[PDB]
């Protein structure tokens, strides 16, 4: 019942002050009970009860914070202290809210020294500083926060990032991470397993452990008594005969023939030596515990003498283990430097794996074990010394990495605050993030850093300018020297960053679009035929542009007419023309057309002024639409062409003309022209389009292209090279010709123009082929004879004209003494006549 406890605290506020005074000296379990009681006290208004912590001018509150949210090495106690502080913040007076959060932010300078324990503190700080009757609370938050706190945040972030970057082992860690099972940074500068000595008697078992162990329970005769002591001892003889040195932990009563007994200790017992007695009437004793360096508080000077001897011995052991760690570090450094120079594996990474994961791990663990033993003995030593006479920053790679990772989410939180945002961008947070954080750290850290950078860049000018400047410079360099390094690895993170920043719908989409266009054109200019550039730079640029061009799926005459007017060209736009200029021009044109003397004159003036601006400002489609390197780029521009043509009929017709102009280039592309031909077939699906091309003389173009291709194949007949895909382009040309012939008037024009000579000659040549006779070639020959009989069946005038063509062919080929061709045409004439 929280409420009754709350009234009891209200009427007995002196009790909670006593608990707060004592909790600094309680042991961990009573600490937990005390903090639980405090949390339930602040579950009713506790306005008057909060002022207990402000005693001694807030010294008690600061001691609570320091001892609890930072110093104590237990996640649960830190989380519970965070909850207690949150309850204090919720139930506190306004002045107490300021005082408590001031106690909180005063530990910023000491935060880096505490390792991973700062997580709960920082989550509490983020929850408290978050802006949510609450106007006054935000006023307290604003009053308490000062620029000094943000300055220290930035300074410690910069110092830790500098430590990580300037670390001698940064390159070793980066190389080893991608090769071996990387799970640490070791280059930074049962009863049987616990026992070391054991003695037995008629009914007692005296055990000396390898060290101090804090045992919470023991699981394994009528009465069973357990004894323990944590006095370091050289041998079990001195403890065998001195019973006064044994402390009775628990007494357990066993039933008859009880094979299992679980003995749990309400308070864990720390003991280096334990003694188990079967008081009254194969044993396996298994203990759940941790290694402990909290040794018994020594009481005399002999104990400090033994402690100093232990200091010397463990220091020598640690020196030996550090020496072996270095001696194994040397070959590890040797093998790492040889990476990049040439069991189905590279044996170098095998040696690296053995060295790093097995022996270096063991050596580092032994060094660390000696280290922790040394802190234990030294801590108890100075404890006794202080009783008698009455956190420094580290270079740990992992600790710095985890602090940086958490500070990225901190910056992501602080970025929504405007004042802090301006202060941080002025301090140079964007350049720091771009240079170090987006390239280094785990994936979660990289995502948090990119999100924080995006939030910082939101709503602020010249931040986008500097960001695009760095991105453009580095990517453009990678473009210029692409043949000498990994374009994919160098520009993956920055390409992703440009992708995410473009998705932002602030007012500065225009600059990002400008950068995308410049990158796309530069990549086309320098590395259009290069595979990596096309796959990793050109393709993302095309994807971003396509996403920009796609309309998200949910007066007409005026809108159509304004579409006929070209408002902004690319040349004008690259030089500084804005979308605001575009909308202004469109609005003026729409008004002039709606009024369409004055509005007519304005319309004409706008038309010519924009035309003359274009003239004053005064191939990549071919390069990328038939790029033999990648099908993805061809498909992407096919989609772009379809999207453009789907909006305007005249633009569609210009696109058809451009595509038809590219038909001769498909001869060299071969199999690469599949996407272009499919796009063409989709585009000319209308009979009007076919007739439009027929008027333009495209049928004759198809005929001469077929003649050129069959001549090219005939020239390859003398060559022994056999290409399986031979005749694919000729196959598609024949398919397009057959599509054209499906219309009656087109077939009439075909017959009238006497173009039947070309198809007969092609039939002769491909039937005469032997070496270049592939499956596609045979299919093409089939389709030729199909067209032939299809034409012949229609009418007698076509038969007469085909006879005339055969007669002329017989003349020209007999003057060339071509026996087989004459035989073929004679056979054709015989087949038609009979």
């Amino acid at each position: 019942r929280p409420r009754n406890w709350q009234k009891y605290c209200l009427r007995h506020g002196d009790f909670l002050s006593f608990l707060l005074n004592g909790v600094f000296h309680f042991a961990e379990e009573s600490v937990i009970q005390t903090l639980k009681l405090l949390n339930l006290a602040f579950y009713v208004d506790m306005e008057g009860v909060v002022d207990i912590f402000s005693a001694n001018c807030g010294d008690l509150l600061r001691q609570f914070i320091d001892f609890f949210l930072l110093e104590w090495n237990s996640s649960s106690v830190r989380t519970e202290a965070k909850s207690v502080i949150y309850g204090l913040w919720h139930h506190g007076r306004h002045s107490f809210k300021e005082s408590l959060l001031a106690a909180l932010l005063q530990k910023v300078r000491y935060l880096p020294a505490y390792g991973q324990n700062i997580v709960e503190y920082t989550e509490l700080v983020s929850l408290l500083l978050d802006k949510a009757s609450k106007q006054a609370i935000n006023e307290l938050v604003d009053r308490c926060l000062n620029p000094d706190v943000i300055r220290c945040f930035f300074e410690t972030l910069h110092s830790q990032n500098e430590l990580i970057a300037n670390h001698p082992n940064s390159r070793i860690y980066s190389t080893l991470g991608n090769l071996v099972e990387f799970d640490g940074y070791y280059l930074e500068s049962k009863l049987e397993s616990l026992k070391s000595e054991t003695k037995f008697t008629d009914n007692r078992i005296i055990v000396k452990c390898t060290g101090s162990y804090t045992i919470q329970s023991v699981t394994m005769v009528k009465v069973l008594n357990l004894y323990y002591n944590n006095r370091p001892v050289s041998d079990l003889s001195e403890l065998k005969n001195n019973w006064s040195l044994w402390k009775r932990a628990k007494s357990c009563h066993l039933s008859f023939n009880q094979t299992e007994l679980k003995v749990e200790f309400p308070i864990p017992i720390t003991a280096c030596n334990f003694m188990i007695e079967l008081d009254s009437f194969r044993f396996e004793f298994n203990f759940m515990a941790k290694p402990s360096f909290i040794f018994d508080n020594m009481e005399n000077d002999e104990d400090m003498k033994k402690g100093l001897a232990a200091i010397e011995s463990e220091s020598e052991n640690a020196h030996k283990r550090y020496q072996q760690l270095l001696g194994f570090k040397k070959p590890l450094l040797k093998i790492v430097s040889s990476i990049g120079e040439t069991c189905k594996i590279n044996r170098k990474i095998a040696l690296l794996g053995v060295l790093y994961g097995e022996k270096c791990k063991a050596a580092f663990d032994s060094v660390s074990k000696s280290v922790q033993t040394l802190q234990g003995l030294r801590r108890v030593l100075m404890s006794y010394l202080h009783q008698k006479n009455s956190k420094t920053p580290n270079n740990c790679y992992g600790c710095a990495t985890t602090f940086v990772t958490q500070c990225l989410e901190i910056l992501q939180v602080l970025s929504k605050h405007p004042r802090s945002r301006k202060q941080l961008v002025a301090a140079g947070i964007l350049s720091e993030l771009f240079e170090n954080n987006i390239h280094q750290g785990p994936k979660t850290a990289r995502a948090q850093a990119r999100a924080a950078l995006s939030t910082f860049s939101e709503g602020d000018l010249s931040a986008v300018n500097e960001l695009n400047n760095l991105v453009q410079k580095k990517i453009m360099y990678c473009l210029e020297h692409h043949r000498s390094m990994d374009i994919a690895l160098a520009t993956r993170e920055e390409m992703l960053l440009l992708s995410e920043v473009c998705s932002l719908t602030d007012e500065f989409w225009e600059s990002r679009l400008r950068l995308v266009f410049q990158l796309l054109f530069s990549s086309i200019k320098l590395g259009a035929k290069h595979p990596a550039i096309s796959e990793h730079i050109i393709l993302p640029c095309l994807k971003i542009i396509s996403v920009a061009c796609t309309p998200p799926k949910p007066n007409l005459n005026v809108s159509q007419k304004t579409r006929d007017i070209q408002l902004v060209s690319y040349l004008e736009w690259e030089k500084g023309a804005s979308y605001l200029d575009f909308v202004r021009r469109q609005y003026k044109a729409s008004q002039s057309i709606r009024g369409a003397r004055t509005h007519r004159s304005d319309f004409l003036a706008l038309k010519y002024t924009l035309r003359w601006k274009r003239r004053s400002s005064r191939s990549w489609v071919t390069e990328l639409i038939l790029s033999a390197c990648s099908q993805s780029i061809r498909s992407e521009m096919c989609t772009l062409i379809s999207l453009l043509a789907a909006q305007s009929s005249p633009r569609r017709y210009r696109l058809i003309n451009l595509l038809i102009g590219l038909l001769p280039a498909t001869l060299a592309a071969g199999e690469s022209s599949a996407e272009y031909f499919e796009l063409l077939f989709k585009m000319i699906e209308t009979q009007d389009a076919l007739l439009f091309l027929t008027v333009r003389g495209c049928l004759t173009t198809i005929c001469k292209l077929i003649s050129q291709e069959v001549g090219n194949i005939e020239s390859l007949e003398r060559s022994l090279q056999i290409d399986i895909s031979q005749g694919f382009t000729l196959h598609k040309l024949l398919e397009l010709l057959g599509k054209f012939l499906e219309v009656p008037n087109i077939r009439s024009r075909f017959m009238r123009d006497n173009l039947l000579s070309h198809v007969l000659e092609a039939l002769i040549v491909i039937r005469g082929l032997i070496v270049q006779k592939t499956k596609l070639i045979n299919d093409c020959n089939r389709r030729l004879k199909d067209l032939l009989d299809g034409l012949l069946l229609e009418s007698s005038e076509n038969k007469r004209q085909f006879i005339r063509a055969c007669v002329s062919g017989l003349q020209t080929h007999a003057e060339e003494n071509k026996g087989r061709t004459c035989l073929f045409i004679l056979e054709q004439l015989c087949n038609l006549i009979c």
Partner: peptide
């Protein structure tokens, strides 16, 4: 909103005109 949808219409049309100009200029 309808105004936002119309603004996206104008933006998509503007970038489409940019592409057509970059292709046909």
């Amino acid at each position: 909103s309808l105004k936002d949808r119309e603004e996206r219409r104008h933006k998509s049309e503007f970038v489409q005109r940019l592409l057509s100009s970059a292709i046909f200029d």
